Amino acid sequence: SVVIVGKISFCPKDVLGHGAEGTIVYRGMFDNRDVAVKRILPECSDEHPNVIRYFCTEKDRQFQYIAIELCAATLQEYVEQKDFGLEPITLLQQTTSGLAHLHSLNIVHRDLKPHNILISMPNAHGKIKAMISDFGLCKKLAVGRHSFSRRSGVPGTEGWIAPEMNPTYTVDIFSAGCVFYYVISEGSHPFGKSLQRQANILLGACSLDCLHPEKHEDVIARELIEKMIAMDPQKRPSAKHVLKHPFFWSLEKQLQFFQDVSDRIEKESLDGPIVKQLERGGRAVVKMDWRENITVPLQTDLRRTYKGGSVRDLLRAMRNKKHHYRELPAEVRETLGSLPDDFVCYFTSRFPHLLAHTYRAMELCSHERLFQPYYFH
Ligand SMILES: CC(C)Nc1cc(Cl)nn2c(-c3ccc4n[nH]cc4c3)cnc12
């Protein structure tokens, strides 16, 4: 009970799902890879680990057999029935890397959605990845079957309709924008419940109610996602921009940014654009007095003249106690914690808006070589 066509092999017993016009997909094999095999009546390279691969096509006297990179599940399955080593941020990163690659090839997906973002079978290293695919897979009620289609609409894909209702790359960034929130909110949409999304979208009526206003990780996510789903397409950042966002930075890269703008400043004028732009609106960020809001053993060690309401001075202080982290009393090293992880969290947990504030403020130096890893050109 095993059909062999060319390099493609499969067992007819193993049906993975069904499509249109007698289209079937089987669990199969190719080049010793576990692949999906779509047998179809015939109609009339530059790859990336995060776009689904189309390996091989083979024909008999009737059908065409296409070998597709096999997936373990659907993103909507990952997010909803969350009983699944790979974390949500890395998932989104891989997805954006795929999407950025497609965009470099002047390709636009037009229908990016949780059913389109596939979860790979674990490779030989036990690693799992995100895969952007043409066809979305859908909940069938059996074991184990799936619906596949390359169309928006179709049951049950509603709630995720092609935002084009000539498309530019901005329809994709908008789509991903919703997926980002879909993943972070563990299964909610930025424009509300299914029936009202279309109405809310067309009016830009979004609500990121899962992103707490005073929590650093949520604040950072909100900044990006808001811009991604911007009502005006021309306020939306390219896929490469999204990759540069602090949303994806490691705790080390975060702290390094902080230290970078700090170093960039200490010779600035306090009257000039750079520092003034950084201080505008910075009292809520610093919490009026940031010496009032850090742990007791630390403000004792500062007792230097840092302006308690100045963002610049806060950043300057963070820099010094990192540059002198070895020369510090053991009391203030254990309150600051390790470097950089505990160290940068020492502040961002207390000053939830510091990074996002400093990030947007320091766009005045985005064109500089110092801030190349933090901004896109
Ligand atoms: C074991 C299940 C969860 N894996 C898959 C089931 C189905 Cl129905 N399709 N599929 C694909 C797939 C991916 C792309 C396709 N284009 N046309 C048909 C396609 C099928 C990849 N991994 C699976």
Residue identifier of the C-alpha nearest atom 6 of ligand 1: 16
CA of 70 to the centre of ligand 1 (A): 6
Identity of residue 111:
D
Cis bond leading into 144, ω under 30°?
Answer: yes
Nearest to 110 by CA among 74, 156, 154, 160: 160
- Distance between CA atoms of residues 275 and 283, nearest Å: 14
Active-site hit among 111, 172, 260, 313: 111
Distance 219 CA to ligand 1 centre (A): 36
Best mutation site among 23, 30, 84, 135 for ligand 1, i.e. most ligand atoms within 8 A of its Cβ? Answer: 135
Q: Under a CB-based contact definition with an 8 Å cutoff, are residues 111 and 152 in contact?
A: yes
Pairing label, strands 8-18, 146-149: parallel
**Which amino acid is present at 333?**
R
19 is in an annotated binding site: yes
SS3 for 147?
strand
Residue with tokens 């909610």: 188
Residues 6+ apart with CB under 8 A from 181: 188, 189, 190, 208, 210, 225, 229
Asked if 321 and 314 count as a contact pair (C-beta separation under 8 A), the reply is: no
137 lines ligand 1 (CB under 6 A): yes
Phi–psi pair at 108, nearest 5 degrees: -120, 130
Breaks, C-N > 2.5 A, in the chain lie after 44, 84, 165, 303
Whole-number Å distance, alpha carbon 377 to ligand 1 midpoint, is: 37
Which of 162, 189, 172 has the alpha carbon at shortest distance from 228?
172
Domains annotated on the chain, with CATH = 1-69 (3.30.200.20), 70-250 (1.10.510.10), 251-377 (1.20.1440.180)
3-state SS, residue 139: strand
List CB contacts of 27: < 8 A, sequence separation 6 or more.
10, 11, 14, 16, 34, 36, 37, 70
Residues 6+ apart with CB under 8 A from 131: 50, 51, 52, 69, 71, 98, 117, 118, 119, 120
- CB of 144 shorter than 6 A to ligand 1: yes
Was 69 annotated as part of a binding site?
yes
The amino acid at 114 = P
Which helix or strand (DSSP H or E) is residue 347 part of? helix 341-348
CA–CA separation, 76 and 174 (whole Å)? 18
Q: Which residue has a Cα nearest atom 4 of ligand 1?
A: 71
3-class secondary-structure state, position 317: helix
| Main-chain dihedrals φ then ψ at residue 246, nearest 5 degrees | -55, -15
Pairwise CA distance, residues 7 & 58, whole Å? 8
**Ligand 1 in reach of 148 Cβ (< 6 A):** yes
Q: CA angle, 158 as apex, 154 and 164 as ends, to 5°?
A: 90
Using CA atoms, how far apart are residues 183 and 196, in angstroms rounded to an integer?
A: 20
Q: Are 113 and 175 in contact (CB under 8 A)?
A: yes
d(CA 19, CA 17): 7
DSSP secondary structure code for residue 42 in this structure: P
DSSP states along 66-79: EEEE-EEEEHHHHH
Find all residues with CB under 8 Å of 319, minimum gap 6, and list them: 258, 259, 262, 263
Name 146's bridge partners.
Answer: 17, 139
Is there an atom of ligand 1 within 6 Å of 17 CB?
A: yes
Rounded to the nearest whole angstrom, what is the distance from the C-alpha of residue 117 to the centroid of ligand 1? 11
Q: Is 89 exposed, middle or buried (0-12, 13-18, 19+ CB in 10 A)?
A: middle
Is 70 annotated among the ligand-binding residues? Answer: yes
Question: 28 - beta bridge partners?
Answer: 10, 35
CA of 16 to the centre of ligand 1 (A): 7
Q: How far is CA 225 from the centre of its chain?
A: 9
Check: CB of residue 362 under 8 Å from CB of residue 261: yes
341 is catalytic: no
Give the integer Cα–Cα distance in Å for 65 and 52. Answer: 17
Q: Is the CB of 138 under 6 A from ligand 1?
A: no
15-22: list long-range contacts, CB under 8 Å, 24+ apart.
Answer: 15/145, 16/144, 16/145, 16/146, 17/137, 17/140, 17/145, 17/146, 17/147, 17/148, 18/145, 18/147, 18/148, 19/147, 19/148, 19/149, 20/149
Terminal C-alpha separation, the chain:
56
The count of other CB atoms within 10 Å of the CB of residue 211 is 20
Q: Residue 56 belongs to what H/E stretch?
A: strand 54-59
Asked whether 25 lines ligand 1 (CB < 6 A), one says: yes
Q: Are 76 and 84 in contact (CB under 8 A)?
A: no
Residue nearest to atom 21 of ligand 1 (CA): 70
